[PDB]
């Protein structure tokens, strides 16, 4: 029941700030739509379990 | 810019981007971001029954 902005300001960035600290990380990205779901993908460097 | 402004900027735009550098293990910021502070006076509270 929330707009994309609300889920981006209150959920995506908060979770992303900690996600930035994981080991062996190549990059991270996040996406939010009007459907009410936020999806974050974290790609790690080659050879990481 | 005062100390609070510098610390807020460091937390907002530096700490996260400074940990994107390879080899950076831990980042410890000796500062805090801005916040809304409500400094309450108990004497004034009791005078209103709150």
């Amino acid at each position: 029941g929330a707009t994309a902005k609300t889920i981006n300001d209150s959920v995506v960035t908060l979770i992303e700030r900690e996600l930035s600290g994981v080991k062996n990380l190549l990059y991270y990205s996040a996406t939010t739509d009007t459907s009410g779901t936020a999806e974050i993908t974290a790609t790690f460097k080659p050879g990481t379990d | 810019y005062s100390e609070v402004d510098l610390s807020d900027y460091l937390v907002r735009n530096v700490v996260e981007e400074l940990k994107r550098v390879e080899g950076v293990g831990k980042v410890q910021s000796f500062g805090a971001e801005k916040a809304m502070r409500i400094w309450v006076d108990p004497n004034k509270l009791v005078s209103y029954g709150l």
Partner: protein
């Protein structure tokens, strides 16, 4: 006694596009000496404080 010295975090607010904490704490002048804490008043059964 519990809310006379420490800080209390309630919720977040939007400051210039970022979620920032809201903290309610007693004024500094009223949390410095034992006299300040010992001057706190509560209502009893009677109207007196």
């Amino acid at each position: 006694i519990s809310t006379s010295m420490g800080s209390m975090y309630i919720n977040d607010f939007p400051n210039q596009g970022r979620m920032q904490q809201v903290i309610v704490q007693v004024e500094a002048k009223s949390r410095m000496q034992l006299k300040d804490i010992l001057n706190l008043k509560v209502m009893g059964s009677s109207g007196q404080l």
